[PDB]
């Protein structure tokens, strides 16, 4: 009665039930399996899905809007995709639907992030193949040594009213291309923090206004978290973003937790019992009660594949 260990999965939530799909361990987890975690009790439940089952992937980007699951991109056995899936989780045994969206989709990619705002799914960044698009792409020279890949700063809207892709004209200093950054939404602000770009794992924090499409760099007073990728960034209030884990430039696995205070524009390191449990490429979801549920991810450097310590642990932070 317990999901198998994994990194690079997806977790999304309604604040009470956490849904978990995909990822890989030591290859991929079964595509048709949808593990559900009750946040109040603490038990699991696996359901097989039918329909347009998406392929088994890592680095996919997923959201829950009114108990409907949406999924974009990721990396499967044959590379990155820009396929978009939804899955109504209110219904019968659940069924995936692959939406053949109108307009020009994002390039195929993984390890990106998304903001939910009104009718809009707004995607940012990623790693995948070369894109006639709005934004900048930046090759990762190590991927030439097949299909070479790289990072982008693309912003993409999927309007769920007509399921049509588009790109907003943004103003301001957009963050550099990046992937394995973390995205968080509060009101009309799409926060992105950290991520890997070229040869760094970064500590910069920006937000995109989802009304005015203005990019703003935030410069907090005092101590900031160390640069990182594969971290999780979670809204826990109208005013606080909860950050945990990740992976540094110098390949350190991270176990530190922080809250970003939006009103104060200040970081606050959060002390917790899980300091021996660093994680990366895990997922985080907020509970309605007031918690952040960390599931899965790896404990050490996942880049050493044959030694990777992938996890099925639930970590619970009282924020």
């Amino acid at each position: 009665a317990c999901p198998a260990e994994r990194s690079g999965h997806v977790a999304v939530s309604d604040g009470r039930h956490m849904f978990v799909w995909g990822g890989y361990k030591s290859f991929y987890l079964p595509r048709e399996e949808l593990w559900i975690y009750n946040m109040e009790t603490g038990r699991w439940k696996k359901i097989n899905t039918e329909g347009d089952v998406p392929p088994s992937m890592s680095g996919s980007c997923a959201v829950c809007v009114d108990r409907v699951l949406y999924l974009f991109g990721g990396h499967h056995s044959r590379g990155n995709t820009n396929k978009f899936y939804m899955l109504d989780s209110r219904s019968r045994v659940l069924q995936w639907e692959r939406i053949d969206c109108q307009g020009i989709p994002p390039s195929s990619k993984d390890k990106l992030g998304v903001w939910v705002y009104k009718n809009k799914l707004i995607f940012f960044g990623g790693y995948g193949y070369l894109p006639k698009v709005l934004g900048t792409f930046e090759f990762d020279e190590t991927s030439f040594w097949s299909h070479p890949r790289g990072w982008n700063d693309h912003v993409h809207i999927l309007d769920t009213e007509t399921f049509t892709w588009s790109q907003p004209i943004t103003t301001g200093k957009a963050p550099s291309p990046r992937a394995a950054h973390a995205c968080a939404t509060v009101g009309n602000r799409g926060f992105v923090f950290g991520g890997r770009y070229r040869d760094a794992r970064m500590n910069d924090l920006h937000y995109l206004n989802l009304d005015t499409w203005e990019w703003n760099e935030l410069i907090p007073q005092g101590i900031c978290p160390v640069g990182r990728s594969w971290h999780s960034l979670t809204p826990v209030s109208s005013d606080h973003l909860f950050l945990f884990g990740g992976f540094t430039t110098d390949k350190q696995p991270l176990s530190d937790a922080w809250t970003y205070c939006i009103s104060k524009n200040e970081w606050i390191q959060f002390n917790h019992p899980y300091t021996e449990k660093p994680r990366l490429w895990h997922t985080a979801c907020a509970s309605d009660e007031g918690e952040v549920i960390v599931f899965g991810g790896c404990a050490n450097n996942l880049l050493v594949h044959h030694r990777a310590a992938h996890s099925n642990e639930i970590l619970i932070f009282s924020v």
């Binding site: 890989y24 890592s58 680095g59 990396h75 991927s143 990072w151 992937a179 394995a180 890997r196």
Partner: peptide, 6 residues
């Protein structure tokens, strides 16, 4: 695999 670029 999917590890790259993070």
């Amino acid at each position: 695999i999917g590890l790259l670029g993070g």
